[PDB]
Design a protein around this ligand. Structure first.
Ligand SMILES: CCCCCCCCO[C@@H]1O[C@H](CO)[C@@H](O)[C@H](O)[C@H]1O
Ligand SMILES: CCCCCCCCO[C@@H]1O[C@H](CO)[C@@H](O)[C@H](O)[C@H]1O
Ligand SMILES: [Ca+2]
Ligand SMILES: [Ca+2]
Lengths: 205, 205
């Protein structure tokens, strides 16, 4: 029995307050924590996982063709307890294995791989400095889990003057309810939610 | 007609995953954005505002007696558009008046007053450096609005290895639903929720 019961990826997405559009010259695609460890909490042969993976694959292929850099985040194995700090009080010691990015989303030679220390991909990482150095100010966000690391990364991005585009059918979560609440929060407060379809159209311009 | 309809402060609070207790030697009391501007979205003579203010007053008095520093945050008037950046796309130009901390919570001579630039009190502020310099690693959080700046500040604190204690009947929000969801999120993911009553007991030790 999977820890996360099967559910269908949302097709209907919340409306955005902002009119932002992805621009290939401005954007970076983040594939957030798509590690074996996190995916194994689902039955990966059941919804939402096959469609999630297909969508991220599509976004990655379009991003590549459009010249959008791709960045992965991954939590490290055997995170030092002192360094992991308060996370352990919420989740225990963390992963010891299954750290690899899932094979269908294998990073390629030019894709950046960041170590993920906290909910937000920005924390204790070079992400902000790299975005600022390169002048990239849009962050397209995919992966798991919507209400935790996806939301926290979007919040940091937005506060750092980086437009977050969270892909509504390009993330998954502990439940459909958590997933949909995450998208509502994002559209209402801290970014733009886009479908995979719409993001690909904006990317390809 | 107030923009935020009257609602009763929650008495029942979510359970915590963590066993943390406020320690007067470790803690700082944050009074977050209790400015005239934000309070005026409510009828201040109607619930939850009279009890909110009473609770924050009580916490402040207990904090003072226990030697816990008190820090206020306040959004500045006429925030420069370039600096305000993406916030304007969600909220418009920001406040031009009503910037004062509400009189019943008047800062005293030794209370720190930080300028609030983003949802999180940490962003573009000396808050983290001050906490680290002083060795204070617990942040008691009160004020408005629960699901936005309170939640975002708690997230940053937690990720910066600072234990957040969000006071469930010491914050308010756009609605009871937003308020209660905020507390559930915090208890589940990024801090401890405490009642004013329980926090005062832990403070007074
Ligand atoms: C409903 C059941 C799903 C539970 C998934 C548990 C995942 C455990 O993993 C934890 O996830 C956290 C949140 O991203 C990370 O911050 C931690 O580092 C990680 O240890
Ligand atoms: C439901 C109606 C309540 C609306 C309250 C609107 C408050 C407008 O104010 C905005 O609040 C934001 C969130 O804290 C801040 O980040 C902005 O700086 C501020 O301009
Ligand atoms: Ca996560
Ligand atoms: Ca707020």
């Amino acid at each position: 029995i999977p820890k996360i019961a099967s559910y269908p990826l949302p097709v209907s997405l919340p409306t955005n307050k902002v009119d932002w559009r992805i621009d290939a010259s401005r954007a970076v695609l983040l594939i957030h924590d798509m590690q074996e460890y996190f995916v194994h909490y689902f039955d990966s042969q059941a919804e939402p996982i096959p469609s999630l993976i297909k969508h991220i694959q599509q976004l990655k292929a379009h991003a590549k063709q459009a010249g959008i850099p791709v960045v992965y985040t991954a939590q490290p194995a055997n995170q030092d307890p002192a360094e992991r700090a308060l996370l352990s009080d919420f989740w225990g010691p963390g992963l010891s294995e299954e750290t690899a990015i899932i094979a269908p989303l294998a990073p390629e030679s030019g894709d950046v791989q960041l170590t993920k220390w906290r909910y937000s991909a920005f924390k204790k990482s070079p992400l902000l400095d790299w975005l600022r150095e390169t002048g990239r100010d849009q962050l397209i966000i995919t992966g798991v889990y919507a209400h935790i690391g996806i939301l926290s990364t979007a919040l940091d991005a937005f506060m750092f003057d980086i437009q977050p585009f969270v892909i509504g059918d390009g993330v998954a979560d502990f439940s459909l309810s958590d997933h949909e609440f995450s998208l509502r929060y994002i559209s209402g407060r801290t970014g733009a939610v886009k479908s995979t379809q719409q993001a690909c159209l904006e990317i390809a311009a």
